[PDB]
C-alpha cells in the first residue's frame, strides 16, 4: 500500500517545515536587527553633534 | 520510481537547509554584537 511512503513523506515535509520556519524567523530577526543598528548609528551621531 | 525522485529532492532540501543554519546564526551573532557595542557607545556619550 502507499502507507509507508505517505508516513515517510510526511516526516520529511515536517522536518522541512521546521527548518523553513527557523530560517524565516532568523531572516526576519536579521532584518529587524539591521534597522536597529541603523537607528542607533543615527542616535549616536546626533548625540555626538 | 516517482517516490524515489521526490524522496531525493526532499532529502537534498533538508540537507541544504541544515548547512545554512550556522551561517544564519553567525550573522545573528554579528548583528547582536554590533548593537551591544553601539548601545554602550550611546550610553557612554549620554552620560
From Swiss-Prot, chain B:
Family label: Belongs to the WD repeat striatin family.
Subunit structure: Tetramerizes. Part of the core of STRIPAK complexes composed of PP2A catalytic and scaffolding subunits, the striatins (PP2A regulatory subunits), the striatin-associated proteins MOB4, STRIP1 and STRIP2, PDCD10 and members of the STE20 kinases, such as STK24 and STK26. The STRIPAK complex can be extended by adapter proteins such as SLMAP:SIKE1 or CTTNBP2NL. Interacts with CDC42BPB.
UniProt organism field: Homo sapiens
Shown residues in whole-protein numbering: 86 to 130 of 797
Coiled coil: 3-47
Lineage, uppermost ranks: Eukaryota, Metazoa, Chordata, Craniata, Vertebrata
UniProt subcellular location: Cytoplasm; Membrane
Its job: Calmodulin-binding scaffolding protein which is the center of the striatin-interacting phosphatase and kinase (STRIPAK) complexes. STRIPAK complexes have critical roles in protein (de)phosphorylation and are regulators of multiple signaling pathways including Hippo, MAPK, nuclear receptor and cytoskeleton remodeling. Different types of STRIPAK complexes are involved in a variety of biological processes such as cell growth, differentiation, apoptosis, metabolism and immune regulation.
Protein's recorded name: Striatin-3
